[PDB]
Amino acid sequence: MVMSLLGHYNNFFFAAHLLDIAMGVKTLRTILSSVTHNGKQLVMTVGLLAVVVYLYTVVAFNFFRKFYNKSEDEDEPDMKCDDMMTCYLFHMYVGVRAGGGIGDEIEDPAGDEYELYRVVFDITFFFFVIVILLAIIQGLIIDAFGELRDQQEQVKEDMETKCFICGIGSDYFDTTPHGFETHTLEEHNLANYMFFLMYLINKDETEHTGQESYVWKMYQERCWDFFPAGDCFRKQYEDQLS
Amino acid sequence: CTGNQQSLAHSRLWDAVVGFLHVFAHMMMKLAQDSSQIELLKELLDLQKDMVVMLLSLLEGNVVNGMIARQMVDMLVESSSNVEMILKFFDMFLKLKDIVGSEAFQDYVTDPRGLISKKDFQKAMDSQKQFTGPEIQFLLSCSEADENEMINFEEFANRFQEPARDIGFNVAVLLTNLSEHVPHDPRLRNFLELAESILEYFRPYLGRIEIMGASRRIERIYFEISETNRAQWEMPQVKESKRQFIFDVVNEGGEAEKMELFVSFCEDTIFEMQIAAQISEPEFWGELEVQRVKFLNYLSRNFYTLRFLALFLAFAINFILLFYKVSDSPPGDENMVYYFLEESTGYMEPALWCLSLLHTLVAFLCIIGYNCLKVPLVIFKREKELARKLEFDGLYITEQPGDDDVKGQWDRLVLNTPSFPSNYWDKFVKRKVLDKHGDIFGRERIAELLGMDLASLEITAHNGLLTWLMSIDVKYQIWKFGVIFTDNSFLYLGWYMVMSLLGHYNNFFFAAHLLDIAMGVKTLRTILSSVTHNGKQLVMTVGLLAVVVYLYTVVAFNFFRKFYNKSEDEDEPDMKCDDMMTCYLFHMYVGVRAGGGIGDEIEDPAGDEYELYRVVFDITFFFFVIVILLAIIQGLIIDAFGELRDQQEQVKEDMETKCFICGIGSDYFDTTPHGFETHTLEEHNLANYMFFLMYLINKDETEHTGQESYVWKMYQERCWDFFPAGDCFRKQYEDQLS
Amino acid sequence: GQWDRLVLNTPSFPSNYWDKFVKRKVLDKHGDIFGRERIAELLGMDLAS
Ligand SMILES: Nc1ncnc2c1ncn2[C@@H]1O[C@H](COP(=O)(O)OP(=O)(O)OP(=O)(O)O)[C@@H](O)[C@H]1O
Ligand SMILES: Nc1ncnc2c1ncn2[C@@H]1O[C@H](COP(=O)(O)OP(=O)(O)OP(=O)(O)O)[C@@H](O)[C@H]1O
16 A cells, blocks of 8 residues: 555556565465475575685685786776675676676686686686576475475375374275265264354353253363264264164 | 282281371371471381382282282272371472472561561462461471471471472372273272372373383383483483484384384483583582683583684674775785775774684684583493494404404504493493303403403402593593594584684685584575585586596597687687697586587687588587586486485374384374374383483392393393384283273 | 553453453453452453452
């Protein structure tokens, strides 16, 4: 509301309402639920990137300070490595967007007794910061997609092999043809138990019966011992009496 | 012995205890007054303890529904109105200890000396209304008037505290021993109702195990769990170590050794509790030693608060290192200088020197604290393993070390000094191996090999600063420090200290402490555990890259050497392919960082009869080296993330469908409502078994009972046959008896 | 926990919850061990007087 009110001061504030709403329509939430599932770990990886490039800034600042000449001639005082803050900004802003690490902008390391000391510096930047540290970022989105799916697969394979009220598996009820399907729709049912609570509360406390008042006493005591949890009225009264 | 167990059942012993109970009920309730006969009262309570102890020993190998068990309840029901007074007397004094020393009672004190004259006890008892009206007036008689003004509650509370606890616990054990055995006895049930206060108070201390033995049947055993032991089990360090052990056993471990690993972890946990107990602070050379001992334990207690300081300083030092600058002309073409450029108040140059000094001190305190907190556990874990090999394996008697492992060779130096079990509890490990292998082999050879005192001089007990250096064993200390210096954690802390010392030579070395520490905080380790999980395979892929590019260097060097001209004109001799070493370096350094392979730098292949012979060369570099070989690198991190998760998912799905002691699944126990949840918290429990080992070792070898001594004999033999592993006392004694 | 201490003083605490007798139920459950009038003032319940 406040941003819409702010939109009259400047009409370009209405673009912010395009973002936060279009994500919540029917399916962009699920896609957005992979990025934010590993949200605590996608930030620490960046925090690891901000440390690795710092250690590369220290080495490049003390030993390779002549190679950062971002000018051609008569403009030598550009040298975006002379102070720690600018070298860190250079190594962080255009230090990871390049595909080759930091060797795509630094001048060519010809034979200077440091060519081999710098190739290791350049080729380790490519591996440790780009190939690997940007594969963890893509390795966390992918694992998130496979973790939310397995989370829902377990639910389907847990609600189709158990009663959610008793502990009896679907194999025991399946001796009778369509026994488990009938057992979970007539005897034990979420709706039936829910409709009972809506029935006890609606009914007056003076109109209860022998069984309703017994349950109502337990419900007010928060002692859920009236749920079976070990029997189904077919394992007790009809195990031998059928 | 079964013969003597039944013999006392068909006897008049029950007629003797009932008379003893009758006098005891009315005796202490009458002797407590006037406080002038405590010695007789204390002796009276001593006799009470021996009666229940004998009664407990009468219920050692009892069947679930046995004649002896059925006779003891008959004794108790006819002894009513007497045991209740015993329990009520215990309850009255036990509640006072909780009431005294509390905030509510501390508000009723009137003088700094501390006393309530005659009736402020009733006012104090009215608050926290537990004592009944008759009960509080009885306690005043049980106390002293003290000229109606000087009733000291501090001494009054500590009069019958210890005697009440020992008798009270044994009664609770005896009462619950019968209840868990005879299930259907209405007389016993109503008898337990008036004893509920005793049972409800001793519940946290009453253990329960299901050892199997001495009858080829499952037998319950009860014992006492101390308050200190339970407190140390709930520490975050201990619980985290427990989770690591369970994870290791389920996945890395396996069957036929689970019990062996569990007992080894149990022994390690006990030693950890021993160390943490002796470093707790609460509860002229002599003065100096006292200060040094307290100071050392101060560092050991505050070890993880120092690791958070060595990192905070390394972050603070590296923040002010962001202002460095290089100038040809120094404010205070050689002679390049480095200086701060804060462009603000100069309160940063002194800060760098101040923080550099502090960091070295903190990084030095950590290595001292580690040397007195975790090193003893390492020594205990190595002395124990060596001791179990001399006796049960004869590693230095019959066999020999494999000659390729340094552990076997280095351990030969320690089994010569009279200090070998310095941290291990088993002090008689030298004689035990002598009595186990001294007959087949030379009896004197073992004596000299172990450095044990010679049998000739073993007469079976016929009968300052300078003084320090003959009490130090040279060989043992050399062996001990060799184990410490090869420890991974110690070396990392040692590297941390030397680098901080090196940081004074050049202030930029303090950036290295930013790396190795920030990874180990709470979650960067797990992220770092995906890169290093497939560490052996991420290196071979690179070793495969260094071979594929070599084979491309050979072809490009022999056939495409004119295309590598890295110059425009008048600078033709650049040609970074003329020799193998430079072409390999060119094809390796800028040969894979490019997005297009090697065609992004090589000159354009126009029509030269080799255009089609080089396009295949270029387009295979893009596929085989870049698209595919850099997808394996990203294909190993991703699989690592999905492998560690499945490793932990299995553990959760394996500890919630099994007992970890028996092999019975959760379905069998779930027939009873919440059966598996109750079974894994009362009958079989990791804490209960762990607290038993801490109980057997603490208890003297001469105070054991029929069941404890049987287990202790098996424990010293390393024969873990007393774990059930096939039954749960509900499948045997209650399958039909319920 | 701290912010919820402000509501258990007015005679409108179970405005939406069905259980209207929640003030007396806690009084009959803890008013014996602790001060019977202390619970009355703590909950803002109408005084027994
Ligand atoms: N009371 C119950 N006890 C056990 N399982 C139940 C129960 N109610 C539902 N189920 C499970 O859910 C299945 C069908 O009910 P449910 O409504 O939850 O599923 P759905 O058909 O996918 O959903 P919907 O009817 O909302 O479209 C059953 O086959 C069973 O596996
Ligand atoms: N002795 C045992 N035998 C079998 N399973 C056990 C035993 N002790 C614990 N468990 C398993 O662990 C579960 C709870 O105990 P545990 O402490 O290991 O788990 P947690 O609740 O996740 O941990 P914590 O209490 O440390 O927070 C039980 O439900 C059971 O699955």
